[PDB]
């Protein structure tokens, strides 16, 4: 996240962090306790995952922490059937054993289609992650969270060569300076509706971090919250 | 400098056949959509067809996509025009166009060709 | 489809004089409109872009502004240089229609 601010611990318990061979190299957010929610180009890789949630400044064990083996990846179904590398660009994670929910360690909620969609037209969204805090600089310690504006379609159409789909939406600041980057990959844009927040985005590109006239990428979760719900209920 | 050089226009009688060809230089050709603008006798402007950097994004004016063919070859920096069964009322100055700025094919146009004149007549 | 509808479609006006032209959508193109310039034997020649904002290399003097439904192009200052026929585009759409354009004719 670039030109955030430090969060507060508990402040986005449904956060959550990808581990690999290399630590932190993605984000998620808890579905349920033995589901995470993330991009696929950040999963779809073959690296065994260590999920890691109730995290807070990433170089120092906190005794908030929880830490779960992944045992099983299912990127969208759509995702690895096109060579667009972007479009549907969401994967859900299966846990070894549940997490325990705590103040640290909280679901995010996720409306149906038609709920999911209004909520993202109020315009203002949060998004949160350990990735660099500047275009191929260093990552952060902290977490770090940003309210970004809805980019309208006409608008994010025109900011780029690139094919724009209906299954993304856009969000950023006319000015630039502020932005998701690389290593926020997979982790949420929320939706706060009177102190409850809701999943409307994942994390997934842009061209280059907070470069004014360009506009960081989402995933469109209305669109596959149906698919969600039924892959992560819980018997 | 900003070059787009359209040629493969001419006379041509009706029912017949042509190739517009833009070849572009000084810039990066592949950074943006293209587009071909014709300027008919009275001198309105009309877009007529674009495409996006990779091709796979385009669309056409009324009453031409079942005769006019839009593409183009990023390895020779060319844009091309395919006309078949020409009517008299083709004949205009087609103009290769660029997309400004974010080379979006939804963009308007910032740079443009001398243009290729081209006359379906008996 | 978006019909664009500029006047005057015929000006006549002396040099340092300030003259208008307005260009009208059919419907709110919100800021998605541009003015060329077009003089004679020439092409087109970009102007202004997102209804306001200037192209690298178009003179201060000129000058647009509008939203919606209702745009201006200002000329400050008229020089005779300025003799061209000038036309708006929208690109709200794909389509991308054209104004019918306003030819400026210089008074002396």
């Known amino acids: 996240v670039v030109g955030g601010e430090d969060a507060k611990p508990g402040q986005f318990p449904w956060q959550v962090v990808l581990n690999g061979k290399v630590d932190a190299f993605c984000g998620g957010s808890i579905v349920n306790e033995k589901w995470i929610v993330t991009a696929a180009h950040c999963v779809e890789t073959g690296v065994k995952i260590t999920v890691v949630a109730g995290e807070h400044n990433i170089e120092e064990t906190e005794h908030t922490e929880q830490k779960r083996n992944v045992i099983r990846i299912i990127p969208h179904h759509n995702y690895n059937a096109a060579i667009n590398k972007y479009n549907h660009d969401i994967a859900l994670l299966e846990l070894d054993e549940p997490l325990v929910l705590n103040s640290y360690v909280t679901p995010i909620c996720i409306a149906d289609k038609e709920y999911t969609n209004i909520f993202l037209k109020f315009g203002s969204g949060y998004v949160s992650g350990w990735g660099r805090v500047f275009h191929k600089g260093r990552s952060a310690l902290v977490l770090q969270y940003l309210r970004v504006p809805l980019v309208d379609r006409a608008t994010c159409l025109r900011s780029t060569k690139f094919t724009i789909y209906n299954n993304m939406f856009c969000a950023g600041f006319h000015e630039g300076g502020r932005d998701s980057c690389q290593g926020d990959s997979g982790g949420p844009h929320v939706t706060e509706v009177e102190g409850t927040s809701f999943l409307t985005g994942i994390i997934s590109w842009g061209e280059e971090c907070a470069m004014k006239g360009k506009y960081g990428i989402y995933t469109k979760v209305s669109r596959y919250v149906n698919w969600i719900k039924e892959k992560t209920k819980l018997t | 400098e900003v070059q787009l050089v359209e040629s493969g226009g001419g006379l041509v009688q009706p029912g017949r056949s042509l190739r517009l060809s833009c070849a572009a230089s000084?810039?990066?050709?592949?950074?943006?959509?293209m587009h071909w603008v014709r300027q008919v006798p009275g001198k309105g402007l009309e877009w007529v067809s674009g495409?996006?950097?990779?091709?796979?994004?385009?669309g056409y004016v009324k009453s031409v996509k079942g005769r006019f063919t839009i593409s183009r070859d990023n390895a020779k920096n060319s844009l091309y025009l395919q006309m078949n069964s020409l009517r008299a009322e083709d004949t205009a100055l087609y103009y290769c166009?660029?997309?400004?700025?974010?080379?979006?094919?939804?963009?308007?146009?910032?740079?443009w060709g001398q243009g290729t004149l081209v006359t379906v007549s008996s | 489809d978006i019909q664009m509808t500029q006047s005057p479609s015929t000006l006549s006006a002396s040099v340092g004089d300030r003259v208008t032209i307005t260009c009208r959508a059919s419907?709110?193109?919100?800021?998605?409109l541009a003015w060329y310039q077009q003089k004679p034997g020439k092409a087109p020649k970009f102007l202004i872009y997102?209804?306001?904002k200037l192209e690298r290399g178009t003179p201060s003097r000129f000058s647009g502004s509008g939203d919606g439904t209702e745009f201006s192009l200002t000329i400050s200052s008229l020089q005779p240089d300025d003799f061209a026929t000038y036309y708006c585009?929208?690109?709200?759409?794909?389509?991308?229609?054209f104004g019918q354009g306003t030819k400026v004719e210089i008074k002396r």
């Open positions: 166009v660029k997309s400004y700025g974010s080379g979006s094919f939804y963009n308007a146009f910032d740079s």
């Open positions: 419907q709110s193109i919100s800021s998605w």
């Open positions: 000084g810039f990066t050709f592949h950074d943006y959509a």
């Open positions: 997102k209804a306001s």
């Open positions: 495409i996006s950097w990779r091709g796979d994004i385009g």
């Open positions: 585009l929208e690109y709200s759409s794909y389509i991308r229609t």
